[PDB]
Protein backbone atom coordinates (compact mmCIF):
# COMPACT_ATOMS: atom_id res chain seq x y z
CA UNK A 1 0.00 0.00 0.00
CA UNK A 2 1.55 3.27 1.17
CA UNK A 3 5.20 2.66 0.36
CA UNK A 4 7.65 4.56 2.51
CA UNK A 5 5.18 6.56 4.57
CA UNK A 6 1.57 5.94 5.47
CA UNK A 7 -0.88 5.10 8.20
CA UNK A 8 -2.50 1.79 7.29
CA UNK A 9 -1.80 0.11 10.65
CA UNK A 10 -2.13 3.46 12.48
CA UNK A 11 1.51 3.57 13.69
CA UNK A 12 1.41 7.00 15.42
CA UNK A 13 -1.33 9.65 15.83
CA UNK A 14 -1.95 10.97 19.34
CA UNK A 15 -1.89 13.99 21.67
CA UNK A 16 1.19 14.12 23.93
CA UNK A 17 2.15 16.04 27.08
CA UNK A 18 5.69 16.80 28.30
CA UNK A 19 7.06 16.39 31.82
CA UNK A 20 9.26 19.49 31.78
CA UNK A 21 7.69 21.42 28.88
CA UNK A 22 3.98 20.61 29.34
CA UNK A 23 3.55 20.39 25.58
CA UNK A 24 3.35 17.75 22.83
CA UNK A 25 6.62 16.12 21.83
CA UNK A 26 7.97 18.85 19.56
CA UNK A 27 10.41 17.55 16.91
CA UNK A 28 11.79 14.63 18.88
CA UNK A 29 14.99 13.27 17.42
CA UNK A 30 14.37 9.54 17.57
CA UNK A 31 16.60 6.59 18.45
CA UNK A 32 14.72 3.29 18.17
CA UNK A 33 15.65 0.65 20.74
CA UNK A 34 14.93 -3.09 20.76
CA UNK A 35 14.25 -5.21 23.84
CA UNK A 36 16.49 -8.28 24.14
CA UNK A 37 16.31 -11.27 26.51
CA UNK A 38 19.02 -9.87 28.81
CA UNK A 39 16.86 -6.72 29.09
CA UNK A 40 19.25 -4.33 27.29
CA UNK A 41 18.39 -2.35 24.17
CA UNK A 42 20.38 -1.25 21.10
CA UNK A 43 19.84 1.79 18.82
CA UNK A 44 18.37 1.40 15.32
CA UNK A 45 18.17 4.67 13.34
CA UNK A 46 17.65 8.44 13.48
CA UNK A 47 14.93 10.95 12.70
CA UNK A 48 13.00 13.93 14.05
CA UNK A 49 9.29 13.89 14.95
CA UNK A 50 6.51 16.39 14.39
CA UNK A 51 5.27 18.91 16.94
CA UNK A 52 2.86 16.23 18.22
CA UNK A 53 5.58 13.59 18.47
CA UNK A 54 4.91 11.89 15.15
CA UNK A 55 7.70 10.42 13.01
CA UNK A 56 7.02 8.13 10.07
CA UNK A 57 8.88 6.68 7.13
CA UNK A 58 12.15 5.60 8.72
CA UNK A 59 11.96 2.62 6.36
CA UNK A 60 9.35 1.39 3.86
CA UNK A 61 6.13 0.50 5.69
CA UNK A 62 5.65 -3.05 4.37
CA UNK A 63 9.22 -3.87 3.25
CA UNK A 64 10.30 -3.36 6.88
CA UNK A 65 10.10 -6.83 8.38
CA UNK A 66 8.24 -7.06 11.68
CA UNK A 67 9.89 -7.65 15.04
CA UNK A 68 10.85 -5.98 18.29
CA UNK A 69 10.83 -2.45 16.88
CA UNK A 70 9.49 0.86 17.99
CA UNK A 71 8.77 4.51 17.32
CA UNK A 72 10.47 5.75 20.48
CA UNK A 73 10.34 9.30 21.82
CA UNK A 74 13.98 8.95 22.92
CA UNK A 75 15.33 11.00 25.80
CA UNK A 76 18.98 10.56 24.86
CA UNK A 77 18.99 12.04 21.36
CA UNK A 78 16.15 14.55 21.62
CA UNK A 79 17.26 16.27 24.82
CA UNK A 80 20.81 16.40 23.42
CA UNK A 81 19.47 18.97 20.93
CA UNK A 82 18.46 21.14 23.91
CA UNK A 83 21.81 20.74 25.67
CA UNK A 84 20.55 19.07 28.86
CA UNK A 85 21.90 15.73 30.04
CA UNK A 86 19.61 12.69 29.64
CA UNK A 87 19.88 9.31 31.36
CA UNK A 88 17.40 6.98 29.66
CA UNK A 89 18.83 6.08 26.30
CA UNK A 90 16.61 3.10 27.02
CA UNK A 91 14.93 1.61 30.07
CA UNK A 92 15.12 -2.03 31.11
CA UNK A 93 11.39 -2.54 31.77
CA UNK A 94 9.10 -5.48 30.99
CA UNK A 95 6.21 -5.23 28.54
CA UNK A 96 3.56 -7.80 27.68
CA UNK A 97 1.23 -8.02 24.67
CA UNK A 98 -0.64 -10.33 22.28
CA UNK A 99 -2.40 -12.98 24.32
CA UNK A 100 -5.35 -13.38 21.94
CA UNK A 101 -4.80 -10.83 19.18
CA UNK A 102 -3.01 -7.59 18.32
CA UNK A 103 -4.24 -4.08 19.10
CA UNK A 104 -3.04 -0.56 18.24
CA UNK A 105 -0.97 1.21 20.86
CA UNK A 106 2.61 2.21 20.02
CA UNK A 107 5.13 3.45 22.60
CA UNK A 108 5.04 7.25 22.52
CA UNK A 109 7.41 7.93 25.38
CA UNK A 110 7.19 10.50 28.18
CA UNK A 111 9.40 13.42 27.37
CA UNK A 112 11.38 13.74 30.54
CA UNK A 113 15.09 14.59 30.28
CA UNK A 114 16.60 11.73 32.28
CA UNK A 115 13.77 9.24 31.91
CA UNK A 116 10.67 8.14 30.06
CA UNK A 117 7.37 6.51 30.78
CA UNK A 118 4.85 6.19 27.96
CA UNK A 119 2.57 9.15 27.19
CA UNK A 120 -0.43 8.91 24.85
CA UNK A 121 -4.15 9.71 24.76
CA UNK A 122 -5.56 6.19 25.00
CA UNK A 123 -7.89 4.80 22.32
CA UNK A 124 -10.38 1.89 22.52
CA UNK A 125 -10.15 -1.38 20.51
CA UNK A 126 -11.21 -0.11 17.09
CA UNK A 127 -10.55 -1.19 13.51
CA UNK B 1 -8.56 -9.79 59.80
CA UNK B 2 -8.44 -8.80 63.47
CA UNK B 3 -9.35 -5.14 63.24
CA UNK B 4 -8.00 -2.98 66.03
CA UNK B 5 -6.36 -5.69 68.11
CA UNK B 6 -5.04 -9.11 67.21
CA UNK B 7 -2.00 -11.29 66.78
CA UNK B 8 -1.84 -12.33 63.14
CA UNK B 9 1.77 -11.24 62.60
CA UNK B 10 2.65 -12.08 66.23
CA UNK B 11 3.49 -8.48 67.26
CA UNK B 12 4.23 -9.13 70.97
CA UNK B 13 4.12 -12.27 73.16
CA UNK B 14 7.18 -13.00 75.30
CA UNK B 15 8.59 -13.39 78.83
CA UNK B 16 10.48 -10.31 80.07
CA UNK B 17 12.90 -9.59 82.92
CA UNK B 18 13.58 -6.20 84.55
CA UNK B 19 16.96 -4.66 85.36
CA UNK B 20 15.91 -3.05 88.63
CA UNK B 21 12.73 -5.02 89.39
CA UNK B 22 13.69 -8.51 88.18
CA UNK B 23 10.18 -9.03 86.83
CA UNK B 24 8.27 -8.85 83.53
CA UNK B 25 7.48 -5.38 82.23
CA UNK B 26 4.46 -4.60 84.39
CA UNK B 27 2.08 -2.06 82.81
CA UNK B 28 4.65 -0.13 80.81
CA UNK B 29 3.35 3.21 79.62
CA UNK B 30 4.56 3.26 76.03
CA UNK B 31 6.02 6.00 73.85
CA UNK B 32 6.80 4.71 70.35
CA UNK B 33 9.91 6.17 68.72
CA UNK B 34 11.00 6.12 65.07
CA UNK B 35 14.58 5.92 63.81
CA UNK B 36 15.53 8.67 61.35
CA UNK B 37 18.61 9.10 59.16
CA UNK B 38 20.23 11.60 61.55
CA UNK B 39 19.82 8.93 64.28
CA UNK B 40 17.25 10.80 66.41
CA UNK B 41 13.79 9.51 67.28
CA UNK B 42 10.39 11.18 67.77
CA UNK B 43 7.43 10.03 69.92
CA UNK B 44 4.28 8.54 68.34
CA UNK B 45 1.52 7.70 70.85
CA UNK B 46 0.68 6.54 74.37
CA UNK B 47 -0.54 3.40 76.09
CA UNK B 48 0.11 1.02 78.99
CA UNK B 49 1.27 -2.59 78.62
CA UNK B 50 0.28 -5.78 80.38
CA UNK B 51 2.15 -7.36 83.29
CA UNK B 52 4.29 -9.22 80.73
CA UNK B 53 5.03 -6.07 78.73
CA UNK B 54 2.37 -6.54 76.08
CA UNK B 55 0.48 -3.61 74.53
CA UNK B 56 -1.66 -3.98 71.43
CA UNK B 57 -4.24 -1.99 69.53
CA UNK B 58 -2.68 1.47 69.47
CA UNK B 59 -4.13 1.73 65.96
CA UNK B 60 -5.98 -0.71 63.68
CA UNK B 61 -3.73 -3.66 62.84
CA UNK B 62 -4.00 -3.56 59.04
CA UNK B 63 -5.12 0.06 58.51
CA UNK B 64 -1.87 1.16 60.18
CA UNK B 65 0.52 1.62 57.29
CA UNK B 66 3.90 -0.06 57.70
CA UNK B 67 7.15 1.76 58.34
CA UNK B 68 9.73 2.53 60.99
CA UNK B 69 7.43 1.84 63.93
CA UNK B 70 7.71 -0.01 67.17
CA UNK B 71 6.13 -1.38 70.32
CA UNK B 72 8.69 0.17 72.65
CA UNK B 73 9.03 -0.53 76.36
CA UNK B 74 9.89 3.15 76.92
CA UNK B 75 11.98 4.21 79.89
CA UNK B 76 10.91 7.86 79.79
CA UNK B 77 7.15 7.49 80.21
CA UNK B 78 6.95 4.26 82.20
CA UNK B 79 9.46 5.16 84.90
CA UNK B 80 7.80 8.58 85.19
CA UNK B 81 4.82 6.74 86.71
CA UNK B 82 7.17 5.46 89.45
CA UNK B 83 8.70 8.89 90.09
CA UNK B 84 12.32 8.04 89.21
CA UNK B 85 14.25 10.00 86.59
CA UNK B 86 14.87 8.26 83.24
CA UNK B 87 17.41 9.17 80.57
CA UNK B 88 16.61 7.08 77.49
CA UNK B 89 13.52 8.54 75.92
CA UNK B 90 15.19 6.90 72.95
CA UNK B 91 18.66 5.60 72.13
CA UNK B 92 20.63 6.46 69.00
CA UNK B 93 21.70 2.90 68.11
CA UNK B 94 21.92 1.14 64.74
CA UNK B 95 19.74 -1.83 63.84
CA UNK B 96 19.82 -4.02 60.74
CA UNK B 97 17.18 -6.37 59.32
CA UNK B 98 15.66 -7.88 56.16
CA UNK B 99 18.49 -9.08 53.95
CA UNK B 100 16.54 -12.00 52.44
CA UNK B 101 13.16 -11.99 54.16
CA UNK B 102 11.32 -10.82 57.27
CA UNK B 103 11.21 -12.62 60.62
CA UNK B 104 9.34 -12.09 63.90
CA UNK B 105 11.20 -10.27 66.65
CA UNK B 106 9.84 -6.96 67.92
CA UNK B 107 11.78 -4.61 70.22
CA UNK B 108 10.68 -5.36 73.78
CA UNK B 109 13.05 -3.05 75.60
CA UNK B 110 15.05 -3.63 78.78
CA UNK B 111 13.31 -1.99 81.67
CA UNK B 112 16.10 0.01 83.18
CA UNK B 113 15.33 3.50 84.50
CA UNK B 114 17.90 5.55 82.60
CA UNK B 115 18.45 3.19 79.68
CA UNK B 116 17.22 0.27 77.63
CA UNK B 117 18.62 -2.67 75.76
CA UNK B 118 16.20 -5.18 74.27
CA UNK B 119 14.84 -7.97 76.49
CA UNK B 120 12.90 -10.96 75.13
CA UNK B 121 12.90 -14.76 75.28
CA UNK B 122 14.19 -15.53 71.79
CA UNK B 123 12.18 -17.67 69.35
CA UNK B 124 13.37 -19.60 66.25
CA UNK B 125 12.30 -18.87 62.64
CA UNK B 126 8.76 -20.25 62.71
CA UNK B 127 5.57 -19.53 60.78
Amino acid sequence: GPTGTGESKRPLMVKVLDAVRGSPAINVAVHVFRKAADDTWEPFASGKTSESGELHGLTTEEEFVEGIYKVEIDTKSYWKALGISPFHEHAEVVFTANDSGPRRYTIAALLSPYSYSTTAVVTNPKE
Amino acid sequence: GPTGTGESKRPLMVKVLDAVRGSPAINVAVHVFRKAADDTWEPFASGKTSESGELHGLTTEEEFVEGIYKVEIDTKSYWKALGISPFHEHAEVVFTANDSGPRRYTIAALLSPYSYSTTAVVTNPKE
Binding site: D38, D39 | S100, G101
Partner: protein, 36 residues
Protein backbone atom coordinates in the same frame (compact mmCIF):
# COMPACT_ATOMS: atom_id res chain seq x y z
CA UNK C 1 28.68 -14.32 33.07
CA UNK C 2 25.33 -12.59 33.41
CA UNK C 3 23.26 -10.41 35.71
CA UNK C 4 21.68 -13.44 37.39
CA UNK C 5 24.64 -13.87 39.74
CA UNK C 6 22.04 -12.37 42.09
CA UNK C 7 20.68 -15.91 41.96
CA UNK C 8 24.10 -17.11 43.08
CA UNK C 9 23.02 -15.47 46.30
CA UNK C 10 20.00 -17.78 45.98
CA UNK C 11 22.19 -20.83 46.67
CA UNK C 12 22.73 -22.12 50.26
CA UNK C 13 21.93 -18.59 51.43
CA UNK C 14 18.15 -18.91 50.77
CA UNK C 15 15.21 -20.50 52.65
CA UNK C 16 11.60 -19.25 52.26
CA UNK C 17 8.40 -20.43 50.49
CA UNK C 18 4.72 -19.43 50.13
CA UNK C 19 2.27 -20.34 47.37
CA UNK C 20 -1.27 -21.01 46.12
CA UNK C 21 -2.19 -22.83 42.89
CA UNK C 22 -4.28 -25.61 41.26
CA UNK C 23 -7.11 -23.63 39.64
CA UNK C 24 -6.55 -24.94 36.11
CA UNK C 25 -6.75 -28.57 37.19
CA UNK C 26 -10.10 -27.63 38.77
CA UNK C 27 -11.22 -26.76 35.26
CA UNK C 28 -9.48 -29.89 34.00
CA UNK C 29 -11.54 -31.87 36.49
CA UNK C 30 -14.67 -29.95 35.65
CA UNK C 31 -13.32 -30.99 32.25
CA UNK C 32 -12.83 -34.48 33.64
CA UNK C 33 -16.24 -35.36 32.21
CA UNK C 34 -15.58 -34.66 28.48
CA UNK C 35 -12.15 -34.59 26.82
CA UNK C 36 -12.79 -36.32 23.49
Amino acid sequence: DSGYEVHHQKLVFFAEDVGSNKGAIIGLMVGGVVIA
